[PDB]
Amino acid sequence: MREIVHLQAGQCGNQIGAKFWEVISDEHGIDPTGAYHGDSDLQLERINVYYNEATGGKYVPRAVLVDLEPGTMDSVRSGPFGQIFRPDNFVFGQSGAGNNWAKGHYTEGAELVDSVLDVVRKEAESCDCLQGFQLTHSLGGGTGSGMGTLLISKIREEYPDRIMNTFSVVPSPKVSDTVVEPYNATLSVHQLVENTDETYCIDNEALYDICFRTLKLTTPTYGDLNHLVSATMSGVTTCLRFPGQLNADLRKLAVNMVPFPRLHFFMPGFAPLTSRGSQQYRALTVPELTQQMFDAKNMMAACDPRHGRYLTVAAIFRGRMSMKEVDEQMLNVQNKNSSYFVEWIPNNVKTAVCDIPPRGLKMSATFIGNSTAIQELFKRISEQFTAMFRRKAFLHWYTGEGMDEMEFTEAESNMNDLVSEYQQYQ
Amino acid sequence: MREIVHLQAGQCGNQIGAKFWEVISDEHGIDPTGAYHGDSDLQLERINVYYNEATGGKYVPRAVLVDLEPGTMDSVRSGPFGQIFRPDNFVFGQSGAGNNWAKGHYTEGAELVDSVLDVVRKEAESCDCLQGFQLTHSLGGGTGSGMGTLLISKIREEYPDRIMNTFSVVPSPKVSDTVVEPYNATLSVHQLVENTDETYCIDNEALYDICFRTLKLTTPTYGDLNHLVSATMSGVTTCLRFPGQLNADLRKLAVNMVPFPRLHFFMPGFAPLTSRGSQQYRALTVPELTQQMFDAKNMMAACDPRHGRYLTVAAIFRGRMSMKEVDEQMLNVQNKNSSYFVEWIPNNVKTAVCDIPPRGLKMSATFIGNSTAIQELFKRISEQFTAMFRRKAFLHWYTGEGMDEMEFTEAESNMNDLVSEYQQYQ
Amino acid sequence: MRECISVHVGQAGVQIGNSCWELYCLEHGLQPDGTMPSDSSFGTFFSETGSGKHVPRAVFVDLEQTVIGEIRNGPYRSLFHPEQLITGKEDAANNYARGHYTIGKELIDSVLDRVRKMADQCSGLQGFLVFHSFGGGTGSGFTSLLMERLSVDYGKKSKLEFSVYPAPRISTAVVEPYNSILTTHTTLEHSDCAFMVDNEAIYDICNRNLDIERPSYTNLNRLIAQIVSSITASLRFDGALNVDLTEFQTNLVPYPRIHFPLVTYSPIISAEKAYHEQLSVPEITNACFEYSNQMVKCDPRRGKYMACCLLYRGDVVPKDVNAAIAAIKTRRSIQFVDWCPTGFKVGINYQPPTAVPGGDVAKVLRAVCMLSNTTAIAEAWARLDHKFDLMYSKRAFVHWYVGEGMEEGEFSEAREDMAALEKDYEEVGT
Ligand SMILES: CC(=O)O[C@H]1C(=O)[C@@]2(C)[C@H]([C@H](OC(=O)c3ccccc3)[C@]3(O)C[C@H](OC(=O)[C@H](O)[C@@H](NC(=O)c4ccccc4)c4ccccc4)C(C)=C1C3(C)C)[C@]1(OC(C)=O)CO[C@@H]1C[C@@H]2O
Ligand SMILES: CC(=O)O[C@H]1C(=O)[C@@]2(C)[C@H]([C@H](OC(=O)c3ccccc3)[C@]3(O)C[C@H](OC(=O)[C@H](O)[C@@H](NC(=O)c4ccccc4)c4ccccc4)C(C)=C1C3(C)C)[C@]1(OC(C)=O)CO[C@@H]1C[C@@H]2O
Ligand SMILES: Nc1nc2c(ncn2[C@@H]2O[C@H](COP(=O)(O)OP(=O)(O)OP(=O)(O)O)[C@@H](O)[C@H]2O)c(=O)[nH]1
Ligand SMILES: Nc1nc2c(ncn2[C@@H]2O[C@H](COP(=O)(O)OP(=O)(O)O)[C@@H](O)[C@H]2O)c(=O)[nH]1
Ligand SMILES: Nc1nc2c(ncn2[C@@H]2O[C@H](COP(=O)(O)OP(=O)(O)O)[C@@H](O)[C@H]2O)c(=O)[nH]1
Ligand SMILES: [Mg+2]
């Protein structure tokens, strides 16, 4: 019944993934041992969406864990929930990607993908009706960017009609840890624009802006960033895991969210987010969830939506709430902000409403933006790429893996073609 | 239902604000955790006016907390009620205002206002019907005076028809802690006369005079001054939070209180106030509440009303009391004191009567004076400003922030224009 | 957040530093090995390493080894990072030009490298606290070399400067007037608030208030550090009216060049008398206006006050302070300028003054540091430029300065620039 297969690539993809599995195990009431310990029948009704039943009523999550180094598998397996995953589903190399896309895609991960893909088959053949693939990765570095997009290509060729749905942490100039980040991302975005049905563009600069300007955390870690990402991952699948007044499958999102085939680079958000010391003073209700959700400080990519227009927004609400009040606020937003929505679509907002809010809050909303403002994320990577590439800097590490200079020229060409298609509807 | 958005600026605004949130949480029966623990349905009926509902029936107050230093956020968050506020609503810088208006308005707070204003949007979009903005600040120093009036300007431009209602602690010569206090206030009053719909002028000299000559406190702290201010803040909104024989919204006050657009610099007071050792000897009743309320020692600005005439007074009574007795005393006052009211208005007193008196007293009255005697507060600041400014003293700290000498000349010009309009109706 | 880099220069600055860091360690409960037994109150003055060791945000600089080799050997040898105790081979010889042009020219780019490695560990650095002698060769010449660099490298950051300044009669050197006048460009152009202090004024405070008949420099430095603890207390602790390091300057400094406040502390008191005096807020406020407690030998009654910062600490209440400053406004002998009708900036902090256990200065519930911009300080400049004039009329020692790379015209250009500051403080009193 609409099973998902989930795949984790590199350090970032395994870290946002290993936090996601702690979040949806809390929702479904699954113990770190894999045993069920929840309150409610609704937690158990759709446990098959993310888990396999095994003997003694132990639940085993349908993750595949992929890396070119053992050290992230060792960090996940030893972690808060590490014992939950199937030992056979940890698929790994020994020598890493070197932060090189071409090691991921052509050498170190091209060896390993035959050992990954045949595990993706065992999980997809155990499904009753697979709806799709949910892949967590980063576009900087070499494992997530280059092996993860190799793996997207292989699963896309094998499962052409299932939803391919990716959560993609990607570079920005003011929060960076790699010299060759622009190269790896430009080579990787070239695969995402052709193969994925949805890609949720996420940024460490925007995830730090939520931690300082909303949550007021003094020292936000990667563990705090991974918690913001995984809340929106739990959010968008909610309507195939729980009952609701308006149900929306990942495909019911895609049909409404993607006007023209390639414009599927979304930008997620979440509400309510409150400063930890301030919760007692806030009224949780649909118009406050709306005034947070649609504000430029809440979105998890550096793009200010005031630099573009939305094509479509989806607001996937959770909790006991009025359909008049939801339909009123999703009208009031796009009429009072009409200069920020495209005027050749007569209603830009999809709504969905689940009856079951996250554990410990009365309501919640996961936001998905599609906006021409995502041109700014692809533009700044393309101009960092260009300034290195005009002087061929660092290319011997990629051409040493047998990659052509022509593949860089063709990747940055396809990047400007993606920038041009969003700028066309501005 | 007539929601208010409340905003705290600088040390003083966050201190009178963080006490106000302890007072109205006692009224509405809200625990320091944010949980409801009150006696009565009437406490819960209008809890939305100052709070948001959140999961588990926790209430989160609709405050935004603004400072250019972390240390007052740290002092509020650690305080008696600090855990009540939303962590995202604490919006702050790192380097302070230096007691400089131009740092507040042009540099340190001009950076931060983009991060404040987008939180004021999340709270105002969560409202069902916003009636107004309730801003606490001081006109001395640099954060409240210069950032708070920047923020008034930004919210006024965005919400032109909602009530802008400010509580403004301001300088006087005999109780002063800053050398440049006159400059900061003169630059700030220039923004208040144009943008606010009401400004409640409050003075530390008058708040110390209440503590020594009425309450007989031996050592009054800023915590005791903040308690007098916050009693009148709870007072003026009472009629949208509780039922009454005569209801008065903040707008029903403004229409009656402000004859000509700019004459909205009010002067608050409260009754009963009694020496702590003397309460058992006093009869709480409408004519004793009146003989305190209308006496020059009770008002919270240094202006003796015997140096002017009132335009309008509003007496917002609370408790079970006779409308004949209220209407009798508000007549007897302005006929027996007729030389102290303007004689081109045929009745100078607005009355309102709420059915619910403050917790622990049988009746109460909040007084709001509008009087031509407020010329003396603007005059003495204008003459302290003039005596420094004739020799350009301290101006390199303001002109260093790119401010003109022409802006000082234009601020003191607009100050004398406000003095002249009150002196015109004398 | 709220860091300060403290730079201790020459023998006077290093020995005041050895009292400052003696105090700050007691006040934050840090052992002399940098460890802390059992809030971020220490963060202004100490970086914390993962071992639980608190390392001071300080640089100690001397052109000769002797005084810093004593810091490297005494009880604080384990407190400081070993490469932020910085020494040369060669003494500056009480010659400004050795400090500035010839000897300090070699150590400066190493001094800056430590200050860079400290500033890169700050997050919203509040300012610099620079400690020195006006009369020294390293004190005048090396501080003036360093400040010129810090004023291009860190142009926005507030530079607070604590100076031991030449006295009316007490002096340790013949060339003390030359080094002090050559320093006046440093304080005018490359400083934001400069606290002049005098050895002879503290010697008289010690005699009259502590009743110590014959004090050393350890007794002086234990008063000079106590003032900087009180300036920084609002950066370090909770208070009723905390004062930011720029909030301080916005009330002290009326005009760009008028940033030379007096400083005083009350109560200076011994254990013989502290149990018989009341030490009420009224008395310790009034003590700051006595000529007897000013730490520069000039009379405030021969001036006018421009602004006062009364920085109270310990058990005080804003009631008491307002009631106190009301009596100061009533007294006709304490005269403010016509253009400062407010006069007083008040700070109030909840942390009492820490006693150094070996010290003369007694335990008390309250203290105030009063920092005060007044026209009177121009007399301490009029004393010293009259000492300069007698020697420069003969060129009395000038060959030692010209011999070490200084232009002879810099003496005229420094006496000229001092006369323009002594003009500015007379001009604003009117
Ligand atoms: C008493 C009270 O109000 O507790 C809240 C709380 O104070 C606040 C501040 C919580 C708290 O969130 C955080 O501290 C936080 C820190 C970094 C990054 C993200 C969150 C909370 O920890 C988070 C926690 O939320 C959940 O448990 C959700 O179900 C969430 N899952 C987890 O956070 C989780 C934690 C550990 C293990 C497994 C899951 C979730 C979100 C989306 C989809 C599914 C589940 C809640 C309600 C609270 C606390 C406990 C203080 C907030 O988060 C959520 C998701 O509600 C942060 O802003 C909201 C507003 C809440 O009021
Ligand atoms: C047995 C008795 O008579 O108790 C009284 C009392 O003795 C007196 C002196 C109280 C008392 O007030 C003070 O001590 C005080 C001190 C400094 C500044 C302001 C007040 C009282 O503390 C204050 C307290 O008032 C309240 O609780 C009000 O609801 C008030 N809220 C708070 O004071 C409060 C305190 C802690 C936490 C949260 C709120 C209020 C005022 C306006 C609008 C809403 C609420 C009351 C009746 C009393 C005591 C307890 C002695 C007085 O105050 C009030 C508001 O009634 C001071 O003059 C009045 C006359 C009262 O008789
Ligand atoms: N209070 C106090 N004054 C000191 C101390 N040490 C020196 N002085 C004063 O320092 C002044 C002279 O400066 P020097 O001590 O020679 O300064 P220096 O930087 O070491 O000079 P050079 O040796 O040339 O480098 C004199 O007026 C002394 O009174 C001290 O520990 N405390
Ligand atoms: N949110 C998040 N970002 C991470 C995490 N670890 C690394 N990143 C960041 O995103 C990039 C991820 O690249 P990485 O996963 O190291 O490359 P790979 O291992 O070769 O795929 C890094 O440069 C970091 O800036 C993590 O746990 N969470
Ligand atoms: N009532 C009251 N007044 C205060 C408080 N704190 C400071 N003040 C006074 O009013 C002025 C407020 O200025 P401040 O808030 O410090 O300036 P800012 O922080 O830059 O906005 C000070 O000079 C004090 O005299 C407080 O808690 N309550
Ligand atoms: Mg020396």
Author numbering:
A (entry chain Z), B (entry chain Y): 1 to 44, 47 to 360, 369 to 436
C (entry chain k): 1 to 38, 46 to 437
From the study:
The isolated vertebrate γ-TuRC assumes an asymmetric, open structure deviating from microtubule geometry, suggesting that γ-TuRC closure may underlie regulation of microtubule nucleation. In eukaryotes, the γ-tubulin ring complex (γ-TuRC) functions as the major MT nucleator, which is essential for cell viability.
Consistent with Moiré pattern analysis and computational particle sorting of capped MT minus ends, we observed 13 well-defined MT protofilaments growing from the γ-TuRC, in spite of the imperfect superposition of γ-tubulin 1 and 14 along the helical axis. To gain more insight into the positioning and interactions of the MT protofilaments, we created a model of the MT at capped minus ends by rigid-body docking of protofilaments into the reconstruction, followed by rotation of each protofilament to reflect known lateral inter-protofilament contacts and optimisation of the fit along the longitudinal axis. To accommodate the larger radius of the only partially closed γ-TuRC at spokes 11 to 14, the protofilaments associated with spokes 11, 12 and 13 are positioned further away from the MT axis. Most strikingly, the protofilament at spoke 2 exhibits substantial gaps to both adjacent protofilaments, while at the same time a lateral misalignment of nearly 2 nm with γ-tubulin of spoke 2 exists. Similarly, the protofilaments corresponding to spokes 3 to 6 are offset around 1 nm from the respective γ-tubulins when looking along the MT axis.
